[PDB]
Each structure stands twice: as C-alpha cells, then as structure tokens.
Amino acid sequence: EWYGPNRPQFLGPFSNPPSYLKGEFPGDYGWDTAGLSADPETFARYRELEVIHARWAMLGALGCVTPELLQRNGVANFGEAVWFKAGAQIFQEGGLDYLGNPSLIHAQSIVAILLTQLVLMGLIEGYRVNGGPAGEGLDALYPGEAFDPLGLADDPDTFAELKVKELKNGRLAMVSMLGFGVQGLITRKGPIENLADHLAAPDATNFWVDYAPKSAGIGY
Amino acid sequence: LVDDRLAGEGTGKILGINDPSLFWAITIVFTIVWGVFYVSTREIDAASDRENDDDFGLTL
Amino acid sequence: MLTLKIFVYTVVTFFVSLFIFGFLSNDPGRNPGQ
Amino acid sequence: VSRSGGWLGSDSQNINLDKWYGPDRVLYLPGGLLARDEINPVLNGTLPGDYGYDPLGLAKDAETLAKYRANELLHARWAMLAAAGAIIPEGLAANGADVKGATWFETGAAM
Amino acid sequence: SVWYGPDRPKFLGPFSDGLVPAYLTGEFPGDYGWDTSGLSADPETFKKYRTIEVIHARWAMLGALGCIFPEVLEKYSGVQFGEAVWFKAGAQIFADGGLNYLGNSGLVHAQSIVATLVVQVLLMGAVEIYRANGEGPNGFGEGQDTLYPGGAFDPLGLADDPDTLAELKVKEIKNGRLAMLSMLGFFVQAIVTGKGPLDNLLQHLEEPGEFNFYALYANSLA
Amino acid sequence: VEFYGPDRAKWLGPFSEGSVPSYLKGEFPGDYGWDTAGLSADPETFARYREIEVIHARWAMLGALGCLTPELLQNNGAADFGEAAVWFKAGASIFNEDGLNYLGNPSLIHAQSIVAVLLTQLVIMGAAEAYRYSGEGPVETSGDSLYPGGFFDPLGLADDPDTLAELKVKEIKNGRLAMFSMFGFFVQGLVTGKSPLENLADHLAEPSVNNGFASATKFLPLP
Amino acid sequence: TILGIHLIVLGLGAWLLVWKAMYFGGIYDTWAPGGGDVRIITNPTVSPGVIFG
Ligand code: CHL
Ligand code: CLA
Ligand SMILES: CCCCCCCCCCCCCCCCCC(=O)OC[C@H](CO[C@@H]1O[C@H](CO)[C@H](O)[C@H](O)[C@H]1O)OC(=O)CCCCCCCCCCCCCCCCC
Numbered sequence: 053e054w055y056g057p058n059r060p061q062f063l064g065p066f067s068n069p070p071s072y073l074k075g076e077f078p079g080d081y082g083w084d085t086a087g088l089s090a091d092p093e094t095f096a097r098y099r100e101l102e103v104i105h106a107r108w109a110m111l112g113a114l115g116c117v118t119p120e121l122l123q124r125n126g127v128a129n130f131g132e133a134v135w136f137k138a139g140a141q142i143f144q145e146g147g148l149d150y151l152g153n154p155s156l157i158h159a160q161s162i163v164a165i166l167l168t169q170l171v172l173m174g175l176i177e178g179y180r181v182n183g184g185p186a187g188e189g190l191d192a193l194y195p196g197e198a199f200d201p202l203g204l205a206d207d208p209d210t211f212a213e214l215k216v217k218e219l220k221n222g223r224l225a226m227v228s229m230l231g232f233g234v235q236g237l238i239t240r241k242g243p244i245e246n247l248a249d250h251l252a253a254p255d256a257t258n259f260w261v262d263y264a265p266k267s268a269g270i271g272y
Numbered sequence: 273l274v275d276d277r278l279a280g281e282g283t284g285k286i287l288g289i290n291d292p293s294l295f296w297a298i299t300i301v302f303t304i305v306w307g308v309f310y311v312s313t314r315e316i317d318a319a320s321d322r323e324n325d326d327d328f329g330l331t332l
Numbered sequence: 333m334l335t336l337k338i339f340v341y342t343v344v345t346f347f348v349s350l351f352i353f354g355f356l357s358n359d360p361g362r363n364p365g366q
Numbered sequence: 367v368s369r370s371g372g373w374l375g376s377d378s379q380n381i382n383l384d385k386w387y388g389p390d391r392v393l394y395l396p397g398g399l400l401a402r403d404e405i406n407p408v409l410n411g412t413l414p415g416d417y418g419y420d421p422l423g424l425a426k427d428a429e430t431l432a433k434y435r436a437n438e439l440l441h442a443r444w445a446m447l448a449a450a451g452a453i454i455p456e457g458l459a460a461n462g463a464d465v466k467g468a469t470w471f472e473t474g475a476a477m
Numbered sequence: 478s479v480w481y482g483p484d485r486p487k488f489l490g491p492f493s494d495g496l497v498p499a500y501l502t503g504e505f506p507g508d509y510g511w512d513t514s515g516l517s518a519d520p521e522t523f524k525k526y527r528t529i530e531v532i533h534a535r536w537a538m539l540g541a542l543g544c545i546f547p548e549v550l551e552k553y554s555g556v557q558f559g560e561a562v563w564f565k566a567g568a569q570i571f572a573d574g575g576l577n578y579l580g581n582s583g584l585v586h587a588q589s590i591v592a593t594l595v596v597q598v599l600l601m602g603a604v605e606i607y608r609a610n611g612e613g614p615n616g617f618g619e620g621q622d623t624l625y626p627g628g629a630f631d632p633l634g635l636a637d638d639p640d641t642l643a644e645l646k647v648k649e650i651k652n653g654r655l656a657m658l659s660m661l662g663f664f665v666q667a668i669v670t671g672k673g674p675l676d677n678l679l680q681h682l683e684e685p686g687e688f689n690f691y692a693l694y695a696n697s698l699a
Numbered sequence: 700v701e702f703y704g705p706d707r708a709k710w711l712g713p714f715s716e717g718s719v720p721s722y723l724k725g726e727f728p729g730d731y732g733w734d735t736a737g738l739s740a741d742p743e744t745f746a747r748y749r750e751i752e753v754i755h756a757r758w759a760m761l762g763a764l765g766c767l768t769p770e771l772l773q774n775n776g777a778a779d780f781g782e783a784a785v786w787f788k789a790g791a792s793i794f795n796e797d798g799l800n801y802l803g804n805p806s807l808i809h810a811q812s813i814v815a816v817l818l819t820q821l822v823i824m825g826a827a828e829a830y831r832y833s834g835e836g837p838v839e840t841s842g843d844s845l846y847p848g849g850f851f852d853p854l855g856l857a858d859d860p861d862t863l864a865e866l867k868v869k870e871i872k873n874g875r876l877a878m879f880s881m882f883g884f885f886v887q888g889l890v891t892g893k894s895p896l897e898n899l900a901d902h903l904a905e906p907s908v909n910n911g912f913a914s915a916t917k918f919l920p921l922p
Numbered sequence: 923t924i925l926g927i928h929l930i931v932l933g934l935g936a937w938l939l940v941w942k943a944m945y946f947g948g949i950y951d952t953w954a955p956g957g958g959d960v961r962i963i964t965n966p967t968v969s970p971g972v973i974f975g
C-alpha cells in the first residue's frame with residue numbers, strides 16, 4: 053500500500069486517478085481535478101512547496117497551541133497568550149519576556165528582530181537551496197545526514213512509511229492552521245477558548261447558530 | 273506695518289528656500305544640465321582611444 | 333522681490349551646474365602631453 | 367556530494383592550512399622580532415596550535431611533548447566547561463532569575 | 478552582455494546557482510532566474526506571461542507617476558485641485574463645479590460620469606483591439622513587434638541600435654517592477670493609514686523613529 | 700454564423716485574427732478563441748478546465764433561477780416568505796421559530812434542525828459526485844463524462860450529431876451568461892445590500908442617478 | 923579599502939564620544955537649569971530636519 057497501483061485514493065472505492073499520478077511519491081491519493089500538475093516540472097515544484105508548507109504548518113500549529121494552553125492552565129503568565137496577539141508584546145512597557153520572566157529574552161526593539169531574522173533566515177534558506185555547512189549535494193527535500201542525527205530513516209521501506217506519515221501530519225497541520233486563522237477572524241478568540249466554549253454547550257456554541265444568521269445585514 | 277518685505281534674513285532655512293518655486297528652479301536647471309551631460313559622456317570618453325576599464329584615468 | 337530671487341537662483345544654479353559637469357567630463361585628459 | 371561546505375555561498379570554504387601547519391605557520395612573535403631558526407626543533411608545526419612558544423625548553427623530546435599535549439587538552443576542555451558554567455548562572459540570577467548560590471566560589475556552601 | 482547569458486546577475490546572489498531553472502537561459506530582459514513556482518515551464522505560457530508583465534510594468538509606471546504628481550503639485554505649488562489624493566480624486570465628477578483640470582474652471586470642466594466612461598470605452602477599446610490584433614486601422618503597424626513596436630511609437634529613435642535597445646529593455650523592465658511594487662505599497666498604505674502617499678513620507682521624515690507601521694498601526698491590525 | 704471551424708465567431712469580432720491562439724482550433728462548443736494568459740496551452744489542463752467550466756455553467760443556471768424565483772413569487776402574491784424572499788437570507792429561514800416552511804405552508808417541508816440538513820446534503824451529494832467522478836454508475840450512460848446522456852436524457856433531444864453540437868453551444872452560451880449574472884448578483888448584494896429585483900426597480904426609477912457610481916464612495920478608508 | 927577601514931575607525935571614535943554623554947557620566951552642559959553642570963543626555967535630537975538645518 054501507499055505506493056504503486058493499489059494504494060488508497062482520495063474518494064474511496066470510486067477511484068479514477070489521472071494518467072500522470074502513478075503512485076511514485078508519498079501522499080499520492082490521486083487528487084488532481086484541475087490539471088495543475090500535468091507538467092512534470094510544475095509537479096516537482098508543487099511537491100517541494102507542499103512539503104515545505106507541511107513542515108512550517110506543523111511548527112506553526114504547535115507554536116500557536118502551546119503558550120495559550122500554558123496560560124489557560126495557569127502554569128505560566130504571558131503578556132499576550134493568543135497566537136494572533138503575541139506579536140504586539142514588543143510594544144508593551146516591559147518588552148517581550150520569554151514565558152514571563154524578565155531574565156530569559158527581554159527583547160525591546162522590533163528593528164533589531166527584523167534585521168537579525170532577515171540575515172539569519174536568508175542565510176539558512178540560501179543554504180537549503182544551494183548547500184552549505186551541512187552538505188553540498190544532498191537531496192532537496194530529504195537531505196538527511198546532519199538533519200537525521202539519530203538514524204530513524206535508513207531502511208528504504210521505513211523511509212517511505214515515514215515520508216507518508218510526515219506528509220499526512222503536515223496536511224492535517226495545514227488544515228488546522230487555516231482553521232485557526234478563519235476561526236480567529238470570525239470569533240476574535242483563541243483556538244483553546246473556542247474549543248472550551250464549544251465543549252461547554254455544543255448546541256448553543258457553534259458557527260451556524262451563533263454567527264450565520266448575523267452574516268447578512270447585521271453585525272457579528 | 274507701513275510696507276511689506278520677504279522677512280527671511282537671519283532665519284536659518286535650508287539653502288535659503290522659503291518658497292517651493294526656488295526648489296523647483298534649482299531642480300529643473302540641475303536636471304537639464306545633468307541630462308545634457310549624461311547623453312554625451314559616452315562620446316566624450318571615446319576621444320581618448322581607450323575603454324573605461326578599471327585602469328582608466330590619469331595615473332602615475 | 334520674489335521674482336528677482338527666483339531669477340538669481342536659476343542663474344546661479346545654471347552656472348554652478350555648468351562648472352561641475354564640465355569638470356566631471358574627463359577634464360584630466362585635455363592636455364598636450366603624450 | 368560532500369559533508370561540508372562554505373558559509374557564504376558557492377566557492378566560499380577556502381581553507382588555508384598553510385597558516386597553522388608547516389614551516390610557514392604563524393609564530394608567537396612577528397618575523398621582525400624573531401627568526402624561524404630560534405624555534406625549538408621538537409616543535410616542527412605538526413600538532414595543532416603550535417605557535418613555537420617554549421622559552422623554558424620544557425619539550426625535551428617527542429614523548430614529553432605528547433604527554434604535555436594530553437594534559438593541555440584535558441585542562442583546556444575542563445576550562446571551557448568551567449568558564450561557561452561559572453559565568454552563566456550568575457548572570458542568570460543577577461538578571462532576575464531564581465538561582466541559589468549563583469556565584470561559583472559560593473555554590474558549595476548552598477547545600 | 479552583463480545582463481544576458483549564463484553570467485547574468487541572479488535574484489539570490491551567491492546562493493542562486495542551485496535554484497535557476499533550465500529554461501531561464503538569460504535570453505530576455507529582466508532575467509534573474511526567479512521561477513521557483515515553475516509557472517513558466519511551458520514556452521507559450523512564458524511568452525504570454527512576459528507580455529502581461531511588460532504591459533503591467535508600463536501601466537504601473539504611469540499610475541505611480543500620476544498618483545504622486547497632483548499631491549506634490551498641491552503642497553509645493555499654487556495649484557488648488559478639488560482633491561489631490563489619488564484614491565479620493567474620482568469623486569470630483571460629482572462636485573458642483575465638476576472636474577476641473579489643474580483647478581481651473583475652464584480647462585476640462587467635465588460634468589457627466591457616463592459620457593466620460595463612454596468616450597474612454599470607445600478609445601481604449603479601439604487602441605487595445607489594435608494592439609491585440611497586431612495591426613491598426615488601414616493596415617497600420619503591420620509586421621512590427623507586438624510588444625516593442627518602434628517606428629511610430631519611437632519618434633526620437635532612441636532604440637535604433639540592438640545593444641542600446643537591449644540595455645533600454647532591461648532598464649524599462651527594472652523600473653516597471655519597482656513601480657509595480659510601489660503601487661502595491663500605495664494600495665496597502667491607502668487601506669491602512671488612510672492618507673496620501675506623500676503625507677506618509679513627510680510624516681515619516683518628521684520623526685522616523687516614531688511614525689512607522691509598527692509604532693502606529695501594527696497593534697490595531699488583529 | 701458558424702460556431703465551429705476556422706470561420707467561427709470569435710471574441711473580438713473581425714479583429715480576432717491576430718489574437719487567436721494556435722491550440723484553439725475550433726473543436727469544442729463555446730470556442731471564441733479567448734486565451735490571453737495562456738492557461739490552456741496543455742491539453743490535459745485544457746480538458747479539465749473545460750469540464751470545470753461546464754459544471755460551473757450548469758450550477759450558475761440553477762443558482763440564478765433559484766435566486767430569482769422566490770422573490771418573484773413573493774412579490775406577485777403567490778407565496779409569503781417574510782424576509783427570506785431575498786436570495787441571501789435563507790439562513791434566517793432555517794433558524795426561524797417555525798422553521799423552513801416550503802412556500803410558506805407549514806406542512807410541506809417544515810425543517811427545524813440545521814445539522815440534519817447538512818448531513819443529508821453531504822451524504823446525497825457525496826454519493827452523486829463520487830459516482831460522477833468514477834465515470835461508471837448504476838445507470839445507462841454514454842462514454843462521455845461531461846455529456847453522459849442516456850439515463851439523463853429522457854426526452855432524447857441529443858440523437859442527431861448536428862443538433863447535439865448546436866445544443867452544446869446553446870448550453871455553454873447560456874451558462875456563461877448565467878455565470879456573469881451570478882457574479883453580478885454577488886457583487887450587488889455585497890455593495891448595495893438589497894435584492895436584485897429591488898436594485899432593478901431602483902435603477903429604473905432614475906437610470907441617470909441610481910447606478911453603480913452612486914455607491915462608489917462607500918468603502919472609503921478613513922484616518 | 924583602506925579608506926573604508928579608516929572610515930569605520932572614525933565612526934567608532936564618534937560613537938565613543940556619544941557613549942560618554944549617555945552612560946559614562948555625561949558632559950558639561952552650560953545651559954542646564956540652575957546653572958551649568960555635568961548633565962546626562964537622554965534624548966538626543968536625531969530629527970532629519972534638525973540635522974539638515
Ligand atoms: C469590436 C469590438 C469588440 C470589443 C471591443 C470586444 C471586447 C470584449 N469582448 Mg467581444 N468585443 C468586440 C466584438 C465582439 N465580441 C463578440 C463576442 C464575445 C463573447 C462571446 C465574449 C466577448 C468578451 C469580450 C471581453 C473580453 C476581454 C475583457 O473582458 O477585458 C477587457 C476589459 C478591461 C481590461 C477593463 C474594461 C474597461 C472599463 C472602462 C473599466 C472601467 C473600470 C471601472 C469604472 C472602475 C473599477 C473600480 C476598481 C475598484 C476596480 C471584451 C470586453 C467575453 C467577455 O469577457 O464578456 C463579458 C465573452 O465571453 N466577446 C462578438 C460576437 C462574435 C463580437 C462582434 O463583433
Ligand atoms: C599604524 C598602523 C601600523 C601598521 C599598519 C603596521 C603594519 C605592520 N607592522 Mg608595525 N607597528 C606599529 C604600527 C603599525 N604597524 C606599532 C605602533 C608598533 C609598536 C608596537 C609596531 C611594531 C611592529 C613590529 C615589532 C613588527 C611590525 C610588523 C608589521 C607588519 C605586521 C605583522 C605583525 O606581526 O605585526 C603585529 C604587531 C603588533 C604590535 C601586535 C598586535 C597588537 C594589536 C593589533 C594592538 C591592539 C591595539 C589597537 C588596534 C590600537 C589602539 C590605539 C590606537 C587608537 C592608536 C605590518 C607591515 C612586523 C614586521 O615588520 O615583520 C617583518 C613586525 O615584526 N610592527
Ligand atoms: C557641497 C557640494 C559641493 C559641490 C561642488 C561645488 C564646487 C564649487 C561651486 C561654486 C561655489 C561657490 C559659489 C556658490 C554660490 C551659491 C551659494 C550661495 O550664494 O548661497 C547663499 C545662500 C543664502 O541664502 C539666504 O538665506 C536666507 C535665510 O537663511 C534668506 O532666505 C536669503 O534670501 C537667502 O539668500 O546660502 C545658501 O544657499 C546656503 C549654502 C550652504 C552650503 C552648505 C554646504 C555643506 C557641505 C560643504 C561644507 C563645506 C563648505 C565650505 C566651508 C569652508 C569654506 C572656506
């Protein structure tokens with residue numbers, strides 16, 4: 053499974069994969085209904101984009117869910133725990149302190165953060181797309197070596213299984229992040245607060261009843 | 273007051289500009305002369321029978 | 333009085349720009365040396 | 367394919383080993399103040415960090431040099447660890463953290 | 478030359494060797510090797526995208542100059558427009574005096590929005606039909622390049638040398654890309670700040686450390 | 700006027716000769732030779748785009764008719780809907796105290812719960828669209844997936860090839876107009892915040908005053 | 923290259939002068955309220971209009 057002509061498809065028993073989706077890459081459920089990947093070059097570029105987006109989305113989902121959970125449980129105190137309000141802490145009087153204590157980061161400037169991020173991220177992305185200290189001729193998407201310290205993907209079959217698992221987790225993370233963004237836009241509250249409100253009264257607290265009738269002619 | 277005057281001496285203006293018309297005059301004339309020079313600076317260099325490489329110029 | 337100031341500014345900037353862009357136009361190469 | 371590369375784009379490594387090894391390595395005195403003939407013959411630019419500095423002539427032969435190199439390496443590594451662990455907790459506690467016995471010469475009496 | 482061939486500058490500096498595609502060989506102006514999304518693999522789509530990009534560049538250059546000109550002419554001159562801000566200058570057609578060019582009640586004095594729209598539709602449709610078809614009225618402009626016509630569109634003859642033409646193509650495309658980015662900036666600044674492009678610049682120059690996006694508007698955007 | 704071959708009507712009239720792409724040879728219905736962005740230079744992408752366009756066209760016909768019908772019925776007195784006559788106010792109807800009563804009679808549908816409606820719609824249309832994507836179902840159909848015929852052609856007006864091609868052209872040309880009109884419906888509802896027929900009546904009251912430019916200053920940014 | 927190196931050195935010297943008036947006790951200010959005295963400069967004028975004036 054997961055490869056070849058006998059892998060699960062994106063619709064179930066109603067299977068009709070295109071001609072260019074032979075089942076050679078991870079997460080190939082045969083879903084191209086727009087022909088966007090008919091060109092092999094565009095297919096490769098889209099594959100790289102999807103994998104990078106998946107990894108970034110996993111990191112972002114974890115980073116958007118962790119501090120709010122910590123603050124709601126009472127374990128730690130932050131200037132702003134909500135994910136879409138965490139950037140405005142740099143404008144507060146006390147600056148930005150990691151986990152609340154003033155002896156961890158104590159960042160005070162936004163220009164310095166911007167310039168340092170520009171330099172560092174530009175250098176590391178140039179390393180990623182060209183090769184640098186960690187390698188010169190490794191793979192574009194799965195380099196390994198220094199980025200696989202404890203060898204977990206060495207058997208070719210285990211490597212493919214882990215590729216599939218990573219892609220599926222990243223896709224779930226992307227959907228969750230889009231949900232985070234739209235949920236914050238509509239409700240103006242954090243994901244954990246929305247989950248708690250829904251779990252309190254599932255019938256009363258939802259999207260349809262709460263906001264849908266006020267989605268035309270009335271405010272939210 | 274009895275009469276009128278510019279009343280700008282001993283003030284400390286940038287280049288003595290109290291009206292935008294002076295700035296416009298300066299900029300327009302400078303740009304015209306610069307453009308005339310910029311069109312011809314390629315022909316002027318070629319009169320030395322040499323290319324403007326890193327070794328160009330009067331050197332000793 | 334403002335018209336006189338504008339006219340004088342125009343004349344002065346014209347002559348100074350002529351001076352600058354003439355001395356920038358490969359002046360060291362205009363000598364009889366071989 | 368390689369396991370190492372430059373930090374500043376393509377063709378950026380440019381490793382110059384002829385500055386720390388061999389007869390042209392940098393010494394502990396500039397060329398004007400000391401000729402290369404005054405260097406102890408045992409120090410021939412083979413071990414790393416060989417600046418040719420041995421005023422007391424304590425390197426009689428190769429065995430003594432190797433033993434002293436082993437001692438120096440052990441002491442150096444312990445020194446890095448000690449310096450880091452003696453400077454960092456005190457700064458952490460002085461900046462607002464809750465650390466007991468932050469100063470290195472007083473942490474023993476804490477417990 | 479410097480801007481053509483395999484030795485041309487690239488968009489990532491020294492890190493750009495491993496990102497340049499095999500079809501961006503350095504044959505057209507503005508080639509920096511940026512096709513990470515692979516949207517120009519097909520040569521036909523590449524050609525259409527090049528035409529779209531050049532047309533957008535020219536339109537954006539004109540738009541940037543025309544968006545910044547009447548606001549500069551109001552604060553630093555004696556001209557009195559009905560409205561100098563670019564995103565508020567369309568409402569002048571509904572004013573009592575109509576739309577007066579340069580603030581003069583006898584220069585254009587346009588009063589009806591429907592007539593202006595009809596005339597614009599006629600003229601722009603005619604010229605864009607001529608451009609798209611590649612041949613104007615009575616066979617005018619036949620055999621000329623559809624993107625770089627020349628001839629009647631080059632009265633001064635500044636592009637009569639192929640090398641000068643290539644250099645000027647590079648200059649035009651770079652200025653156009655800069656103008657496109659500046660117009661995106663104009664749009665977003667108009668949405669967020671609500672003031673003219675020149676007011677933002679002058680307010681920033683009043684105190685650069687105090688009047689920025691981060692110091693004023695960043696915290697109110699979430 | 701011909702609609703197939705090199706002499707067909709095109710998207711710029713007599714001036715389309717220099718703008719028709721090479722790959723648009725006039726082989727499919729609704730071919731006016733309009734491809735300026737080169738989005739259909741790949742045959743597979745072209746076929747998928749054609750399928751998407753046809754499905755969008757049919758959905759647009761249904762949407763336009765269903766948006767126009769209940770408002771006309773309410774205005775002519777054939778039914779009572781209250782504030783649900785307007786096309787973008789059916790979610791008010793589902794959350795009504797009496798529920799979604801079809802045609803105003805509380806004995807036709809009388810839907811109360813929104814979750815049930817969503818679940819049944821999801822199940823039914825999942826089955827339908829999965830069957831459509833698979834290309835083979837429990838019904839009698841031709842080889843074509845876009846134009847199945849057979850079970851979906853009871854009256855049988857798609858027998859003669861010439862009439863079938865002409866009907867394909869008619870379908871695509873009505874669908875494109877329906878799509879344009881539905882886009883107009885969306886934009887008008889967002890801007891004016893009124894009914895399409897109310898907008899038509901207001902425009903007819905004063906065509907030189909009540910037009911789209913009378914609300915051009917609505918979304919003006921403020922300092 | 924040599925010119926750039928010495929420019930960097932001179933800029934470091936100017937910044938060294940700046941640090942004295944801010945953190946290392948300040949500099950004598952003859953316009954200080956209540957007579958001249960060694961003040962500390964906390965809000966320097968970095969306005970482009972003031973510097974260009
Ligand atoms: C001879 C003149 C002639 C002209 C000028 C056109 C022109 C056009 N035809 Mg064609 N046709 C012509 C003859 C014929 N057509 C057709 C058959 C068709 C069909 C079947 C179709 C077209 C379509 C179109 C449009 C395609 C391009 C477009 O949408 O972007 C050009 C437009 C723009 C870039 C801007 C428009 C200018 C306007 C003044 C803008 C005003 C801006 C706002 C006031 C401000 C906006 C506010 C801000 C916030 C956004 C275009 C309007 C297609 C279509 O798009 O229909 C809707 C279509 O499907 N034509 C036939 C029958 C054989 C013709 C016979 O001679
Ligand atoms: C002003 C700039 C200057 C420059 C560009 C040079 C340049 C040179 N020196 Mg000279 N030199 C200078 C001043 C300078 N020197 C001074 C002030 C002294 C007196 C100590 C010397 C004494 C000297 C010796 C003894 C030798 C050279 C030699 C050389 C060469 C470098 C090799 C080397 O090992 O030197 C390194 C020399 C050092 C003094 C050690 C480094 C000390 C660090 C850099 C000082 C940190 C201080 C800081 C930068 C300055 C702050 C004060 C400032 C504001 C004034 C090179 C040609 C060598 C040569 O000729 O070989 C044949 C050599 O033998 N120089
Ligand atoms: C700085 C770039 C230099 C480029 C190369 C120049 C080459 C030489 C060109 C010719 C120069 C001489 C003729 C200049 C005539 C025009 C100027 C004039 O008359 O202004 C006369 C005007 C007077 O402006 C008056 O202002 C009043 C209010 O203040 C009123 O408004 C009056 O009406 C108005 O006339 O002054 C200026 O424009 C100010 C000029 C300031 C110049 C600052 C230069 C900074 C950079 C250089 C620093 C070193 C300068 C030398 C210092 C040591 C000298 C020993």
Ligand SMILES: CC1=C[C@H](O)CC(C)(C)[C@H]1/C=C/C(C)=C/C=C/C(C)=C/C=C/C=C(C)/C=C/C=C(C)/C=C/C1=C(C)C[C@H](O)CC1(C)C
Nearest residue numbers: 083084085086105108109112115116135138226227229230
């Ligand atoms: C398949 C197919 C096929 C056919 O053919 C066609 C079609 C249909 C089109 C297709 C589809 C597609 C899709 C579905 C897509 C999607 C996407 C997404 C959703 C993404 C996201 C994505 C997402 C993402 C990345 C995300 C990210 C995130 C992040 C970084 C974050 C960050 C952060 C954090 C930590 C925290 C803080 O406090 C804040 C911040 C700073 C903010």
Ligand SMILES: CC/C=C/C/C=C\C/C=C\CCCCCCCC(=O)O
Nearest residue numbers: 591594595598599600602603606614
């Ligand atoms: C208020 C909106 C008004 C819009 C104007 C209405 C209709 C214009 C119709 C067609 C535009 C034709 C433009 C000229 C094309 C032919 C040019 C030629 O060859 O002469």
